Design a protein around this ligand. Structure first.
Ligand SMILES: NC(=O)NCCC(=O)O
Ligand SMILES: NC(=O)NCCC(=O)O
Ligand SMILES: NC(=O)NCCC(=O)O
Ligand SMILES: NC(=O)NCCC(=O)O
Ligand SMILES: [Zn+2]
Ligand SMILES: [Zn+2]
Ligand SMILES: [Zn+2]
Ligand SMILES: [Zn+2]
Ligand SMILES: [Zn+2]
Ligand SMILES: [Zn+2]
Ligand SMILES: [Zn+2]
Ligand SMILES: [Zn+2]
Lengths: 485, 485, 485, 485
């Protein structure tokens, strides 16, 4: 069996917190309540003075992605181990289909790579990086049979992944038809391409050139544009890696205006800023390079945390896409060649707790919402995950909100040899991680086998995403004026 | 016993909706799950094609209030009956303590009046309409022993209930000390007093004078002021009856800015507008008169519903404070003498469903949040109410979202002889109402006895309200700069 | 000679108003001051109780444009006559170069058509409707030798005039190089194309389909996008025909943010709204059809006037592009075939005075700014026009602000057989119009000859437009961080 | 006579810039034009490579004010000398009438003190620090006979100058009746009083306590409140010393909304920030203390300059109210006793040029608007001052925009022994200052006699301020609905 009783702790769900024990049997939570009996043989995890929360769900990872010449060093095995050590029990990774390549082939290739390696549960989003009848069919198959209800489109990466407004319109229309959510990388790829060309011609080859060629206006513009096209076809939209105040404000305004759109800041944009691109040490600066870039306005991470607290922004991922110091160095003379991507999978939970809960910006319940529950709602497996309740999956973290840990590449479990949060002292430590009903992390040690985690198959038409869309299809149809001919 | 099994319906909570039966025994929900056994003797309510939702909680009523010369016609008995017929199973009414009068006496007087009459559960807020050592002591007693964690302060009603900024500061400080929430009637009472004097001198004695003397700037101003004072003392704030776009925007901005404040639109401001004050029929116009007034900008109710959907605004009441046609007529020659107050207790649920869910602005789950769950969270009895779950109170409504009912003073159960929503066709009908585990409304008929309802005693420091306040007390203390003398 | 002395009136300039006579000799104002001597032979125009203002400058006309199959009925001759009768003494018309056609040929063709016909002064903007080395050269020639410092680009009209973001970037870059201002028609042409296709498939063929296929989000999106690209290249930008609140707000925000951008509402969007597209009479509805469309939110024209008063919006034109009732009827069965364009050249001045000055939104001086002075500043001939002062051109209107005139296609001087402002009672009447130092309109009668007006040759680098751009070129250059290799 | 010909320079007015000489005779500009003849005897000031601009007008000074126990060290003599040396040729100083004291007596006392000492022209605003029939009469006399059209009211300084909302309403009403503009010190005096009491009890006695007791919310709140009351009585309003982003945004929103209100940032809030209150050196920190305080958000001065460039904010003063290092030291142990006030009169022009024009935020013409022209328009002597034109007063500065000067208490002409802009390198130097047609400053040396300057008597109903107010009185009267009784 493996029975666990988590005793003495305070359960924290998105709605409220309460003292109760949690009885885990066979991969599931089978009872939640005060003073539960320890069945003979069951292991007791003593959660006295700890919070018992749903494991974190990272909506946004790229484990071992082949990108910009080289492949990310955190792979599905190490990446999921590092996740677990940081209190994160599921990741959602992007199938980065190449232009002209079958989405089903790319999906198959990702499942073959990840299935034997993941140490925690996971699922996949599929990038739609070109358009045709075939992609159209494949999206339906993915949504109805392969357990994927999220497709990722790019407005940046000109020549590589970018789609133009007419194609986004079509793609978004078909997302709505198959009951998928549309995710977008929202930056203006034409401005980025011109921008970088210009920074290089001016001899600005360092990482400050990377930020200067695509300042936050370029992100805010494409964010509004994506929302507008999606609003025109009544397709639900998800803006991945919101990095800037102005893009966050676009999302905030559109939601207030009743648009079905969700904004996802990431640990990087919540925990540090882009002043690091101006560091005198080139290696240090390059560590932070990713698209969109972190912003040189120091008030950014605090502001994004305030909007995350208030639900202008709704949930978090990390965009974990790591490259070692010697891989980043590929762009020593030209920032367009630094492989883009930062760490976060392991530290997300502590970073958000320290910058969001300890700071007084959000409460512990909103913390659960924005680290697991909302991901489960949008991507369609709530309350199977994201809630401590009978019948839910036993993905559970015992959390110490009072003790601190200092984040350091010297003690972290990620494969990357630096950490963008190097030195940060965070309140909020994952003391014990349970995944699929097994203790996989405790006393600073991991106990898990590659392949122990499972792919989570999801159904389309997630209710949290589609119930308003469908009611608007029914009452928001345009009408003709009846006239004499 | 009275056992009820509600079978075949779809349960709708704030987080998600799911098919399940609900077993009610002894005033409580004792089981929720699929295909439950009907125990011998238990009555089955067939909820096939219906939603099974928590009963509505009206945060804002004034049943039989003696006000402006006369007393409201809907009393605790008829008012709670009408509530039940409209799908609302709890009301929170205001103890309107007079200036210089003991808050404990006023509280006692309200409990004596309401206890033998209420047909559904209820609780009370207490108005703090003057300030002194005695009021200070009485507030502590109310909060610690009398089950009241909400105190109501007025920035309008000059000469009558109004408090100045220094007194609000003190009052708000002491609310924070006793773990109460501060509610405010946010209009500038000095502008209202000057405004009305001016409208009368210009011979504008009709109800249009009532709105013109205190247009929405006057509400927005006092709303910002209340938020600022409350932010200065770190006291949680609740703005009652938000009537206008601009005041709603103040609340929306303050929350985005991380201020602990909640905004409560009411059915009136969600379901109609203030163009009615300009109606050629004086009686018709006077029906809508209340403070703050409904606004002549027709886009108002739709905008307030959009902000309620997005959580800029968080929950709803009705400010039910009804006066018959012949009572309103007291101000035939002078709008300052029309007793202020409109209906809503009965129609709130259908009005919000039609204007909010049927319109596609919010989903059924957000509907439960803004009609019961959030009230229970703020006023500190969740999930005892506001949730369909084992151990919760059996206050449950079987709801038909597809059928319409037309609202009319001819068919309504309120004592008042008109209805501000006269003629409105609403999708969303309460077909069966269960209160304290008894069927009190079914087949258009009420079956309930005055006194059947119970006063709900609450504890202070509601966690949903105070967890951020307390963390800010711990990390947001101002520090001195250490200097050589 | 033709000497005129305008006596007894109050001169109104953009900065202030003052009593003075104005002495006109040889096409120029040669003296302004109190109690001027009447030289023997000079005609006195008695301006007692009248304002003496600079003639209106219409920044935005399409006289006799061949468009959507047919050509506008108001031609350079009738159009300029109608302008004069309405108090407007200069128009700036768009050379609508076709895709692949020489801009110089189109320019020559417009000068040949207009020179022998105009009855008042005029100048030209040139549309850049495709991109290449040749267009690049021609733009330089136009700017340096042909008196044109304004080029017009389209984000709408897919297949016809539309340019993509990379081309706008290049085009805007070259505008900056030649010291021109970039004008943009800011709507998303991909959304319009999809939108219309969809409205037709739903059998919405009436004019309401025209507005519904491109609601204001589509305008606001492209407006932000244009501003962003122009900000990226430091090119000054001008947004023509701002029709909606949301697009106006984009412009307002960008200016507050220090972006060099100007917004131009037109008489149509200041004086009426798009509810007319829903009129039961098809002919009536089609009268209002133009791109972007007038908006069905009735608060629009008032809001645009408030932003024009506050300088969020800076100056006005009419987009005068008129088609008779039988020409509009070309789209009786399909709104995509209604020739787009409304009237305004004649009524602009009275419409803006009535809706802006008489309403109390702006003063008479701001009225001069937004009807002549700012056009002269941006398009680079101030104070030669747009000011009553010694040495300025004698384009002068004697204006009665107190008397009303009702606008009617029955009394107007435009060739079109209807008027979108039909029935409007406007305070503010042009009683006498002086153009090039000659009385061309008085006692309701026109006295002017086709060809009397002159083309105004302008120089590039208008100081009002470029002084900030050039200082930013000097201090806003991006810098490299100096690092060890 | 004293004739001066200023030759070879570029004249810069609010509307445009142009090459011309300026002929000065007898205190007036008597001709402006190219290549003017030098009359025998006239002194030529060679303005080759210089701008010739209207002298600066400082709307906001307190020369030798007795305040908080002691009197400001810059008096009318030294203060006006320092003004002249900085390119400022007029100051408007506040008659600080004490509570219960005759406004006419205070006015007389200020004229007696200033008349024999001023070295440049000046005028006065009168503070209305209490309310009664007598103050009412005195305000009329001041406005009609004493040349004052601006009255200053306080929402801060509880116990000392503060007025409550009902009194502001009355005061603002009477300002409108006498054709005066209402100026307000907009901070919530009740919050300040509580705030400071709290900071002291926590042992925060340093200048950081001064800012922390009244953060920018306290300013923004009172700013909105003042605007609302003034909007209710249709009285034009002027918000003095706007110090914070949020208060500036209130003003910006109200103007966009068509409210007649003007915002005046000062040199301090445009040129430095409130991080200085946290300096380890107490003397340094105390130098910056004034009400409202400078703000610790470093983006503030840049943001205020952007809103000044865009006309959200309209004109500038300095609030010059200086106290020596040993006078500031009066509050060594208690920040409530540091005499409030900073320097600026001398450096305003260079500070604004460097931070506003050199930075690319505004052009030279907007610079003239916000340093002289708008003050002259609002306070009612334009174009007698604020314009280089025939008949205007010869208050003229020859300005070098290319050379820098470093500001230092070691080289400045103010009496105060420190400078809040210490060390700042500003482009933009006043090389020659002409006041009343005499060279009073050249080659770094002053040549002027105490009493040479004149008091400027103004008339009420300034047109720039009142033309919209009066039109709204005529068309914005509320109407009754006509009903059967
Ligand atoms: N961009 C980046 O740096 N991380 C992942 C690649 C992407 O999605 O943009
Ligand atoms: N105002 C009103 O009309 N209803 C209740 C009384 C109040 O709270 O203002
Ligand atoms: N569009 C329109 O209706 N008038 C002129 C053509 C254009 O510029 O769009
Ligand atoms: N406050 C200040 O520091 N300067 C002048 C006094 C005032 O007006 O507030
Ligand atoms: Zn991305
Ligand atoms: Zn990514
Ligand atoms: Zn109230
Ligand atoms: Zn109430
Ligand atoms: Zn156009
Ligand atoms: Zn046009
Ligand atoms: Zn002040
Ligand atoms: Zn002052």
């Amino acid at each position: 069996a493996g029975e666990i009783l988590i005793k003495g702790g305070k359960v924290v769900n998105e709605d409220c917190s309460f003292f109760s024990d949690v009885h885990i049997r066979g991969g599931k939570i089978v009872e939640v309540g005060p003073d539960l009996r320890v069945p003979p043989g069951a292991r007791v995890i003593d959660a006295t003075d700890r919070l018992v929360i749903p494991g974190g769900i990272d909506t946004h990872t790229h484990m071992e992605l082949a990108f910009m010449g080289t492949r990310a060093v955190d792979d599905f095995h190490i990446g999921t181990k590092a996740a677990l050590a940081g209190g994160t029990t599921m990741i959602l990774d992007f199938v980065m289909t190449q232009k002209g390549q079958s989405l089903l082939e790319a999906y198959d290739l990702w499942r073959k790579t990840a299935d034997p390696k993941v140490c925690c549960d996971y699922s996949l989003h599929v990038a739609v990086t070109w358009w045709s009848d075939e992609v159209k069919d494949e999206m339906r198959t993915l949504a109805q049979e392969r357990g994927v209800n999220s497709f990722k489109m790019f407005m940046a990466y000109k020549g590589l992944f970018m789609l133009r407004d007419d194609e986004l319109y079509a793609v978004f229309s078909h997302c709505k038809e198959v009951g998928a959510i549309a995710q977008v990388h929202a930056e203006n790829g034409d401005l980025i391409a011109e921008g970088a060309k210009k920074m290089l011609s001016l001899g600005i080859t360092g990482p400050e050139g990377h930020e200067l060629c695509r300042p936050e206006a370029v992100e805010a513009e494409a964010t509004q544009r994506a929302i507008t096209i999606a609003s025109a076809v009544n397709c639900p939209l998800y803006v991945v890696h919101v990095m800037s105040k102005s893009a966050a404000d676009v999302v905030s305004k559109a939601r207030k205006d009743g648009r079905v759109v969700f904004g996802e800041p990431i640990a990087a944009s919540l925990g540090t800023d882009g002043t690091n691109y101006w560091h005198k040490d080139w290696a240090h600066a390059a560590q932070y390079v990713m698209g969109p870039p972190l912003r040189p306005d120091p008030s950014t991470p605090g502001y994004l945390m305030d909007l995350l607290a208030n639900d202008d922004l709704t949930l978090t991922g990390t965009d974990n896409c790591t490259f070692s110091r010697c891989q980043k160095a590929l762009g020593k003379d030209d920032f367009t060649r630094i492989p883009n991507g930062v760490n976060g999978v392991e530290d997300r939970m502590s970073v958000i707790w320290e910058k969001g809960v300890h700071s007084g910006k959000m409460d512990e319940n909103r913390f659960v919402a924005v680290t697991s529950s909302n991901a489960a709602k949008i991507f369609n497996f709530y309350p199977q995950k994201g809630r401590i309740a009978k019948d839910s999956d036993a993905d559970v973290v015992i959390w110490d909100p009072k003790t601190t840990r200092k984040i350091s590449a010297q003690t972290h479990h990620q494969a990357v040899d630096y950490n963008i949060f190097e030195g940060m002292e965070c309140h909020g430590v994952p003391v014990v991680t349970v995944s699929r009903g097994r203790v996989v992390y405790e006393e600073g040690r991991l106990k898990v086998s590659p392949g122990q985690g499972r792919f989570i198959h999801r159904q389309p038409f997630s209710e949290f995403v589609y119930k308003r869309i469908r009611q608007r299809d029914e009452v928001g149809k345009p009408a003709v004026v009846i006239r004499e001919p």
